[PDB]
Paper text:
The bottom band had a λ260/λ280 absorbance ratio of 1.65 with particles sedimenting at 128S and composed of capsid proteins VP1, VP2, and VP3 but no VP4 (lane 3), and contained packaged genome as verified by negative staining. Hence, the bottom band unexpectedly contained particles more like uncoating intermediates (or A-particles) as opposed to mature virions of other picornaviruses. In addition, the high infectivity of the CVA6 A-particle was measured to be 3.6 × 107 TCID50/mg, which demonstrates that A-particles can infect cells efficiently. The above results indicate that the isolated CVA6 A-particle is biochemically similar to the uncoating intermediates of other picornaviruses, but functions as a mature virus that has a stable structure and is highly infectious. The CVA6 A-particle contains characteristic structural features that are typically attributed solely to picornavirus A-particles. These include large, open channels at the icosahedral 2-fold (2f-channel) and quasi 3-fold axes (q3f-channel), and a collapsed hydrophobic pocket beneath VP1 ‘canyon’. The 2f-channel in CVA6 has dimensions of 36 Å × 8 Å, which are both similar to that in the CVA16 A-particle and the EV71 A-particle, whereas the channel is closed in the EV71 virion. In contrast to other known enteroviruses, CVA6 A-particles display unique interactions between its capsid and the packaged genome. The cryoEM density map and atomic model of the A-particle together reveal that the N-termini of VP2 and VP3 interact with the genomic RNA near the icosahedral 2- and 5-fold axes, respectively. The N-termini of five VP3 subunits extend beneath the VP1 ‘cooling tower’ to form a well-defined annulus with the key residue P3 making close interactions with the genomic RNA. Here, the CVA6 A-particle examined in this study, unlike the classical, mature picornavirion and instead more like a stable uncoating intermediate, may require only minimal conformational change in its capsid to enable release of the genomic RNA.
Numbering used by the authors:
A (entry chain B), E (entry chain B): 30 to 42, 53 to 137, 146 to 250
B (entry chain C), F (entry chain C): 3 to 59, 62 to 172, 189 to 230
C (entry chain A), D (entry chain A): 71 to 205, 214 to 290, 304
G (entry chain C): 145 to 172, 189 to 192
């Protein structure tokens, strides 16, 4: 039903933002085609531009928060295929060589990024074992939605929002999307993220 | 008045001793709570992780075993052995990778099967398990006379099989009970994915390099 | 079930480096420095990366001899340069004095020197994975995992003609480990970076068919 | 009545093997491996076979010197390869690293190294007699009596010209013994197998008659 | 009267066979001629073919049991001679050299095997000291019968019935059979074995 | 502040010390019950085992001492000394083989005689025991004046003789008291077998190689 | 050997001069 990451709720350890910064932020919808592979957002990065959250995170010096993130998918009963959603702390991507990953890959922004090599998760680690992180399944016949709550996990009490990314959210289609002719080609995948117990310091 | 025994001056070994502090009076940064502390590797064996049954001579397509309408009712969909330390499907699982760091292991395992097809699809599969001594079944009817389960796509989207015990062996095969049934305007083929894990009684002995 | 603990899995002492002073040959330099690196070998690098954060105390032992595996009595100095201190330039450099830098004086004849280093990080734990920029090269680096440099020296007026080989061993004590991480399938390319080769190796070996010893 | 105990009868330390590294001669190899074998001598083989099953802890000591019975300080490595691990191929092989393989570093000058091996069997006891096939040669063999290989090495850059002779001793501790077995009358032919010669030797010596010192 | 081997009764430590597998199994009769030397059966091997016991022991993976074994001899009062019956755990035969023993010697079957060299018990160990094992005497003037109960003795809790033999039963005529002319030449020796507390696992 | 005594660096010896564990944290397989544990060699001396009295200049025929109708009534059937550590009949016994591992032994022994002839046979034997100082008896009548027993085949099929004490010597002889009596159609010769053992008070000292 | 695997009795002349066998049920078939 609902996944608590590592068994804990987020909590306070500064100025504490209220309802203005704690609302739901609905990101633009991704389309999952039969040919599609993967996405990863890697926030706090994703909300640094948008809204009041982005205003606080840029002009305050130190940062702490935790996130509720809801992934949900609109498909008919004639569409099939499965997704895997995971939240991986300190998710450090890599370069594949014929060498540093480019900033557009490391900090993809509010629109996320595509996997080149989902099988290695672009980290050189198997996707088979990505189930060791907090995860949920979306099987289009069983369910349309997945929800994960991530508490703040870092070595330091606070850290900077712009330099350091605490974790990343990966949505991968292990079983491809198949549909008979006449059906809608793209199946939309939308992402809604509400920060919880967020604190800012050093305005 | 003391005497020195044959083992005196040696450091050859893994002995747990006591050394001098190199910096006395130094204060390490205090502990704070970090969520997710894992104190034993034996509960990393117990999480289900995707198992490459396909692994035929492909990428992310090695993780899923295809099923379709095969026009011959009684047929073998797939098969794999149940030993996690051996080269094969279990190398992709987490229980299989941390068996490669130890010499011996024993206990019970479970396997979970998810059917990924459309909501409209219907059928049955027969999932059989052969003990360590016996060779695998030749036919569907030989497979039902031992441990098995019949599993129905429409009613049940996931099924679990606990294999009873194993040591460093048992084979599990999947059979078509019925043809793959669909209404018109629906895709005719689908997939299944397996998830390997270890039970509570699983144990490990004598660490070794991988 | 004790051998499956996280504290037993990291237990034993193992070879963390091999270094040589070499003042005999075309190199008359007569000293060496060795930045402490836990991951220098890929066998121990892959076991450590099973965890994102971990916190431990270290125990170092120095097994030293000559090219003959002979150990005549001659005096060596093993100093310790903690993080944030300068390294020696040469044999006679003043950094070999400097009381804050702990040093050990032991003959080749003696049993191996041994000493214990605390937890040196400014953070509460060591980060083997860091997603972010500490301020291209800078991506994924932790400046706060540095433990210090040692730097062995032979105590000699000038130029002995002997090369001294010394092997360093490390134990992990009082270890505590946090959120788990999968084990790397791909081979490593370079020391610090995760980067992997363009040709992907499969995780499981091939068999003739899906049906099938 | 204490000297007739089963625990006193197995008590003392005794020579269980003699091995040599020999990098001086036509053999420049410079190392050796020694599979642990308790029955290597027929005097101890016959005492052990008084019991079908037995369970004990072992204590090894290494008495090492040169061909002169001279012991100059030079560094040796005594590793231990537990059952199920690979043996070293050569002097520089990576198996000489491998932290799981316990190793001891001791000079020839030092008193003999000493270390204690636990009960290593997967069975509850060691079987000196096994009637059956573990899966011709295979009849009567126990794969689970293997204790590991040791493998001494001199720690040397290259090719010293000295042969090192080392003598191994074993103690039996905490011994427990099960169903008794008669003592062998016939001489032994080969190491593992019971096989005996076609010409039977009598158990008791001959006298002139049944009547008769 | 009756010999308990090593002072214990067999007992359970799986499926437990009942009366069908626990009955008496009478093996074909051996004839002891004045020239005869020895026999050894070496079971569990002997019952692996016969009856319901043999059905269970072949198709189950692991095995445990203990046996009651009754040896009895039909002779008149004009026959003399003595036998020794012993049950030896882990009885490993050998080859005599002018070299491995042949499978027909190691696993003789339901018909047993003849000793070449009874004086060494074909193990290279003296027959004089075979009395250290559980044993009984048959002296044709005193008694016709001998009975020995053997509990399960092994290092492992269970083991395989086909590969491993737990013990063996040896019947040896230390004092030869003599009879005056006109008497029956052969003296029959029959063997009846009932397994006790037998368990099977891994069908 | 310590000082090193003259015995410091030596390993020469049988000393019971303490070494370091080579594998700390290793768990040996637990104990289960195995029937037949023997905790002392001194109760292996006490089982009766067959004694080769014949051992004349033959195989399994060395274990038994033949008796027949000898037509001379008073005669010596056989004789053997009573020392188990000495070369002779006692090498076949178990008490004699584990005396060869020790320097000294003392205590009482017993000897059992079984008559193997036909149920129809009848007769008497005289079994005598001569102390360690004395030479063996020349005649039947000299043998009865010391320790003896007369033993009857028909009445008694087995007899036992406890020799009182011995140290690392005593001789036991067997005499014909009467002729060997049989009805017609019955074999005229038979056998006897001896079984050596040690008593409860038997002890052993200072182990030695064999 | 096929006969001992069913209902049987072994009978000894010296020990026992007479033996009895009760056949369990029959109708108007069994062979001994």
């Amino acid at each position: 039903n609902i996944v608590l990451s590592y068994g804990e709720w987020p909590e306070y350890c500064p100025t504490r933002p209220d309802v203005s910064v704690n609302r739901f932020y609905t990101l633009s919808t991704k389309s999952w085609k039969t040919e599609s592979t993967g996405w990863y957002w890697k926030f706090p990065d994703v909300l640094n531009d948008t809204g009041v959250f982005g205003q606080n995170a840029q002009f305050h010096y130190l940062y702490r928060s935790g996130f509720c993130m809801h992934v949900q998918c609109n498909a008919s009963k004639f569409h099939q295929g499965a997704l895997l959603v995971a939240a991986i702390p300190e998710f450090v991507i890599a370069a594949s060589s014929p060498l540093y990953p480019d900033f557009a890959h490391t900090n993809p922004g509010k629109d996320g990024q595509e996997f080149r090599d989902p099988y290695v998760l672009d980290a050189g680690i198997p996707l088979s074992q990505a189930l060791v992180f907090p995860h949920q399944w979306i099987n289009l016949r069983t369910n349309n939605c997945a929800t994960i709550i991530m508490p703040y996990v870092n070595a330091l009490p606070f850290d900077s929002a712009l330099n350091h990314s605490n974790f990343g959210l990966v949505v991968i289609p292990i079983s491809p999307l198949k549909y008979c002719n006449g059906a809608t080609t793209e199946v939309p995948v939308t992402l809604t993220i509400a920060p919880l117990n967020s604190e800012f310091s050093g305005l | 008045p003391t005497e020195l025994k044959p083992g005196t001056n040696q450091f050859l070994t893994t002995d747990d001793g006591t050394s001098p502090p190199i910096l006395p009076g130094f204060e390490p940064t205090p502990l704070i709570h970090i969520p997710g502390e894992f104190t034993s590797l034996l509960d990393l064996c117990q999480i289900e992780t995707i198992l490459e049954v396909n692994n035929t001579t492909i990428g992310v397509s090695r993780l899923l075993i295809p099923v379709r309408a095969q026009n011959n009712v009684d047929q073998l969909c797939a098969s794999f052995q149940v030993d996690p330390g051996r080269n094969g499907p279990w190398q992709s699982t987490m229980v299989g990778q941390i068996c490669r760091y130890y010499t011996q292991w024993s206990g019970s395992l479970k396997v979970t099967f998810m059917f990924t097809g459309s909501f409209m699809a219907t059928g049955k599969m027969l999932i059989a398990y052969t003990p360590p001594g016996s060779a695998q079944p030749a036919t569907r009817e030989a497979a039902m006379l031992g441990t098995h389960i019949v599993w129905d796509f429409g009613l049940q989207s996931s099924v679990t099989l606990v294999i009873p015990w194993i040591s460093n062996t048992g084979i599990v095969t999947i059979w078509y009970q019925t043809n793959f049934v669909v209404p018109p305007d629906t895709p005719t083929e689908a997939n299944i994915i397996a998830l390997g894990a270890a039970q509570k009684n699983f144990t490990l002995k004598l660490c070794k390099d991988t | 079930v004790n051998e499956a603990s996280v504290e037993h899995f990291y237990s034993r002492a193992g070879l963390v480096g091999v270094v040589e002073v070499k003042d005999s040959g075309t190199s008359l330099d007569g000293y060496t420095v060795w930045p402490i690196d836990v991951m220098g070998f890929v066998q121990q690098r892959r076991k450590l990366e099973l965890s994102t954060y971990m916190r431990f105390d270290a125990e170092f032992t120095f097994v030293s001899n000559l090219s003959n595996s002979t150990t005549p009595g001659m005096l060596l100095q093993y100093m310790y340069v903690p993080p944030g201190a300068p390294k020696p330039d040469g044999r006679k450099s003043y950094q070999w004095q400097t009381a804050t830098n702990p040093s050990v004086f032991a003959k080749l004849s003696d049993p191996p020197p041994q000493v214990s280093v605390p937890f040196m990080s400014p953070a509460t734990a060591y980060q083997w994975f860091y997603d972010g920029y500490p301020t291209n090269l800078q991506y994924g680096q932790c400046p706060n995992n540095m433990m210090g440099h040692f730097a062995i020296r032979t105590v000699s007026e000038s130029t002995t003609g002997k090369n001294v080989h010394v092997r360093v061993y490390m134990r992990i004590k009082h270890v505590r480990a946090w959120v788990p991480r999968p084990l790397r399938s791909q081979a490593y390319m370079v020391k610090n970076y995760p980067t992997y080769s363009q040709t992907i190796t499969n995780t499981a070996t091939d068999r003739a068919s899906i049906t099938t010893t």
